[PDB]
Design a protein around this ligand. Structure first.
Ligand SMILES: CO[C@H]1O[C@H](CO)[C@@H](O)[C@H](S[C@H]2O[C@H](CO)[C@@H](O)[C@H](O)[C@@H]2O)[C@@H]1O
Ligand SMILES: *[C@@H]1O[C@H](CO)[C@@H](O)[C@H](O)[C@H]1NC(C)=O
Ligand SMILES: [Zn+2]
Length: 1016
């Protein structure tokens, strides 16, 4: 019995969209608490029978890359922090410390001798050192895909379970730039009971503090019942540093950061230094500190107070451990002995804080409010909204999504078999998982690291892509070769991957041409993989050395194909134009591949001396004044030329698209009879302020609304084919392409911002749709949340992450834009959508990076554009905070994020080749995905185990029957099943032993994990 995620509006105490509509967002000087007020407390609130219990929680924020690389920080800082934590905690049994980033901890632990490993395990087992979250990193929450948030969580927690025998149930996220409800969603399904966040808008902190709503049960926006709820603590102040964690007055709190007295090269900007605690000052010092604590305690509902004690890369030097510990010990001894304070203070861990809060709750001392919504877009002060990092370093944002899919496909393809250790499958997959996991860091995918650190992340991800390719192609060879013939060399390349959209045409010449010829090689096998659990057809393309190529399946059935030229665009420094050149040596062949659920399909490409019966050739039309010829080698159809003009295209029975004379979409007509709906693409530019605060990697501070890019008279190329047509235009900084294959168009932008300093390029869609001030954007590729433009906030506050899509709608019409990469975007006026393409910024934005963004490189952004009639759809009510995709939009998103994978057989002949794998796999209902398939055991395990993460989205009911699908039971995908268990999403805890060894399908918007055990 599934909860209805559409028709029941949850009743919550705080709903963030509603809160935003009501709040004034005034930025007034609140006094010492600059963004709050002067807190008052009744000194008689605490007495002998009701004391304030204070947990001082030492911590050290360690960025896995930011200003230095991961390895540089490890050598210079983190290895010392961890080595000294081990010594100091061992020697001081009441001292405590929390640790978040398992990438660093694993890097350290594996370099320890056994003696030290044992000492480390002992300070963990006794609770002095406590892991918080236990992910590989502390991830970004804006740009990250939920699948990769889960991947990195699993990587860190699997390491902790194996080596430390612990699994954290409290999360610590002090640093991501705004916070997403995807986090409690994943954490609550991974055994967590509590979480902590910090970087929320200063106005939200003030509002919630006033109502004592900084601790709340955070549920998903659609969750009527509350089963997704996770207890959440929001910190109240401007920073997680010591000046902003003891209480509301940083001039006072800074005096209790004992690293700031001078010899460490640190000081207090409020001009009052810390003083060493002595018997002659401890009473006065304690009075000041307890004062701060009791003020902070006024903001919360229990008598249990959390005081973080730390900052970036703290607790390095032995002298620093001593100075913080000894001074706090003197304070605690005094405070705890002086009845008049009515305080019991101690070093603690995060879990100890939460346990004590919940003890107070059970004692009936507090009830907590319920909350739904998100915490974007963050501003830390004034109008400094952190919407710039939704776009910064977009090449690597796109690379994240490519590697996301590669990791899934490599793990899935190799899961079907057990592999010998010599095959190095587990080794390559662990490397790939860890490099993608590292990049989820809040200075990785966010694009907020120094140039050489971005380079490090890129090199790591490139190695991870090669690892995935190796595992994938070994797996394909095994799955599709007759078993008695299969003779693997585990170092050999049986196949190479062919990827048409990464790095992309015009980004890198990386694609191999299939070289055929009468005097060399008549034919070539290619294989497609489909990681999705339903049959899929999709056009696929390969480069070939002749236009006279035909396609067959492995039963030798002809397959209809289309050949087109290979076009590349060149900024001609002679003529000062951007125009295409066609290859005279290679050609593109395109055909529909039909591939089983989670399966493989083989095809053959064969050369002939002349036009094959089942291959057609696209026409090509170059629109420009003053054309010159465009020879195409053997290509059988001459290029046509014309002056710029409006054009219309229709592929199959799909929509008819009309384009301006500048090659940009102007309208879509869904069906023969239907209207030509205005849908206009436009490119614009934002600039930077010449006075006041400057945009940088983090902040978007535009100097007003965007101005149209001056287009001149651009060259437009039209390719018209039976299977695929396109319009491409060379605009300043963007080669913009609209591709039609018979359904929703695909948009590709090759974006090269070149040397345009202090410029952000935006792609806008203008329509008639009466959306008003409402639009929808996704959170981590998991859910769509309703946004409301607010004219009381500046432009940059109305920008939100677009990690996978966005839409606007009215009563009748919806326009959805799906993305293959996370970027920033908004709807700044009724009927508009816009999404930032790249940004190049000369200035630092005072958040610690110490550089602008001047390392741009060409990137190929990909999208799908879905215009739909929605008046017949069953949509949520006007008060519901969520929205949901249609079937077509969801499929278009899957097309972008998890396309078919293409393999080209490397050798001349593939002996023992088979035509298909997975023809007997169940074809599951369209809303269900097998997000993860991963074998969990190495070959020496008697009982093999395979883990599956199943996710069911929720698609709108719009009157399409779309029926008959097969039940997917992941537990019977592999033979000889002996047991099936439901587990946490990390696979680390068994939750239910399943009857009949059958894994049930999940409810809409739910994600479940299962592990099947096999005795073979
Ligand atoms: C201006 O911020 C600098 O000082 C504060 C202390 O109040 C530090 O928190 C940060 S470093 C911190 O935040 C940046 C974004 O500002 C992030 O990129 C890093 O990962 C860190 O988490 C600054 O040094
Ligand atoms: C892992 O933790 C639990 C703690 O109760 C314990 O039963 C188990 O023995 C531990 N495993 C060890 C210490 O190897
Ligand atoms: Zn950080």
């Amino acid at each position: 019995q599934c909860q209805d995620v559409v028709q029941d509006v949850p009743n919550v105490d705080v709903q963030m969209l509603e809160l935003y509509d009501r709040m004034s967002f005034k930025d007034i000087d609140g006094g010492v608490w600059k963004q709050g007020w002067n807190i008052k407390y009744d000194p008689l609130k605490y007495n002998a029978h009701h004391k304030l219990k204070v947990f001082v929680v030492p911590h050290s924020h360690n960025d896995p890359g930011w200003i230095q690389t991961f390895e540089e920080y490890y050598q210079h800082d983190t290895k010392h922090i961890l080595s000294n934590a081990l010594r100091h905690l061992h020697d001081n049994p009441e001292m405590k410390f929390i640790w978040a980033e398992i990438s660093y901890f694993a890097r350290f632990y594996h370099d320890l001798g056994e003696n030290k490993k044992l000492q480390m395990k002992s300070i963990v087992k006794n609770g002095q050192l406590e892991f918080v979250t236990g992910g590989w990193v502390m991830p970004d929450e804006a740009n990250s895909h939920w699948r990769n948030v889960l991947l990195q969580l699993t990587e860190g927690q699997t390491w902790l379970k194996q080596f430390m025998n612990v699994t954290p149930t409290a999360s610590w996220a002090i640093a991501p730039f705004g916070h997403s409800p995807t986090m409690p969603y994943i954490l609550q399904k991974s055994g967590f009971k509590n979480m902590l966040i910090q970087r929320t808008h200063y106005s939200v902190k003030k509002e919630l503090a006033q109502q004592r709503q900084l601790e709340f049960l955070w549920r998903q926006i659609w969750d009527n019942k509350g089963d997704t709820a996770l207890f959440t603590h929001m910190m109240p102040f401007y920073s997680y540093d010591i000046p902003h964690t003891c209480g509301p007055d940083p001039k006072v709190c800074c005096q209790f950061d004992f690293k700031r007295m001078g010899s460490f090269g640190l000081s207090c900007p409020w001009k009052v230094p810390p003083r060493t605690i002595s018997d002659q000052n401890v009473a006065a010092r304690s009075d000041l500190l307890v004062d701060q604590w009791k003020k902070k305690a006024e903001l919360y509902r229990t008598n249990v107070l959390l005081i973080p004690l730390g900052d970036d890369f703290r607790f390095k030097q032995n002298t620093e451990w001593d100075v913080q510990r000894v001074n706090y010990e003197r304070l605690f001894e005094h405070i705890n002995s002086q009845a008049h304070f009515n305080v019991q203070a101690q070093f603690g861990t995060l879990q100890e804080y939460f346990d004590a809060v919940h003890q107070a709750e059970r004692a009936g001392q507090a009830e907590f409010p319920t909350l739904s919504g998100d915490f974007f877009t963050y501003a830390d002060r004034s109008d400094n909204y952190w919407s710039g990092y939704y776009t910064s370093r977009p090449y690597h944002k796109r690379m994240d999504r490519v590697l996301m899919h590669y990791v899934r496909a490599a793990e899935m393809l190799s899961a079907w078999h057990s592999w010998d250790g010599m095959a190095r499958i587990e080794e390559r997959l662990e490397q790939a998982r860890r490099e993608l996991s590292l990049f989820q860091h809040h200075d990785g995918i966010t694009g907020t690291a120094k140039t050489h650190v971005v380079v490090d992340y890129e090199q790591r991800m490139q190695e991870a892509l090669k690892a995935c390719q190796m595992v994938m192609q070994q797996s394909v060879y095994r799955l599709l070769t007759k078993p008695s013939i299969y003779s693997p060399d585990f170092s050999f390349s049986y196949f190479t991957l062919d990827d048409s959209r990464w790095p992309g045409s015009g980004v890198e010449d990386s694609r191999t041409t299939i070289i055929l010829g009468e005097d060399i090689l008549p034919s070539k096998h290619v294989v497609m993989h489909n990681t999705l659990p339903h049959w899929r057809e999709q056009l696929v393309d390969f480069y070939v050395s002749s236009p006279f190529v035909s396609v067959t399946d492995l039963a030798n059935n002809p397959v209809e194909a289309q050949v087109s030229p290979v076009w590349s665009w060149h900024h001609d420094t002679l003529t000062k134009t951007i125009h295409p050149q066609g290859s005279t040596t290679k050609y593109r062949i395109i055909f529909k591949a039909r591939v089983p659920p989670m399966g493989l399909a083989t095809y053959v490409l064969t050369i002939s001396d002349s036009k094959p019966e089942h291959t057609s050739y696209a026409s090509n039309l170059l629109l420009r004044k003053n054309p010159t010829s465009l020879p195409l080698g053997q290509y059988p159809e001459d290029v046509k030329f014309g002056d710029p003009r409006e054009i219309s295209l229709r592929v199959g029975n799909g929509p008819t698209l009309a384009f301006s004379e500048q090659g940009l979409l102007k309208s879509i007509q869904l069906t023969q009879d239907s209207p030509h709906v205005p849908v206009h693409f436009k490119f614009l530019k934002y600039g930077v302020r010449s006075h006041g605060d400057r945009s940088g990697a983090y902040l978007f501070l535009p100097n007003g609304p965007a101005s149209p890019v001056e287009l001149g008279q651009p060259v437009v190329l039209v390719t018209k084919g039976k299977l695929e047509s396109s319009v491409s235009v060379g605009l300043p900084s963007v080669v913009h392409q609209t591709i039609m294959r018979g359904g929703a168009p695909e948009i590709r932008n090759l974006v090269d911002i070149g040397s345009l300093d202090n410029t952000e390029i935006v792609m806008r869609l203008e329509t008639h749709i009466d959306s008003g001030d409402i639009f929808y954007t996704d959170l981590n590729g998991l859910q769509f949340i309703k946004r409301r433009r607010l004219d009381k906030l500046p432009l940059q506050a109305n920008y939100y992450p677009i990690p996978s899509g966005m839409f606007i709608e009215d009563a009748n019409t919806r326009l959805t834009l799906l993305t293959g990469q996370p970027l920033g975007g908004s709807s700044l006026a009724s009927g508009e959508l816009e999404i930032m393409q790249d940004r190049r910024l000369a200035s630092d934005d005072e958040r610690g990076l110490g550089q602008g963004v001047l390392d741009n490189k060409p990137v190929l952004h990909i999208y799908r554009l879905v215009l739909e009639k929605v008046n017949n759809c069953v949509r949520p009510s006007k008060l519901h905070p969520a929205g949901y995709l249609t079937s077509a939009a969801h499929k278009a998103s899957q097309s972008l994020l998890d396309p078919l994978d293409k393999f080209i057989f490397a050798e001349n002949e593939w002996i023992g080749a088979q035509g298909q794998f997975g023809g007997d796999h169940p074809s599951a209902r369209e809303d269900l995905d097998v997000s993860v398939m991963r074998r969990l055991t190495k070959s020496s395990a008697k009982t093999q185990r395979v883990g599956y993460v199943l996710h069911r989205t929720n698609l709108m009911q719009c009157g399409t029957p779309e029926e008959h699908t097969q039940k997917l039971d992941v537990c019977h995908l592999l033979p000889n099943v002996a047991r099936c268990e439901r587990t946490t999403l990390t696979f680390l805890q068994n939750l239910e032993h399943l009857d009949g060894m059958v894994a049930p399908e999940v409810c809409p918007m739910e994600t479940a994990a299962y592990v099947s055990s096999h005795s073979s």
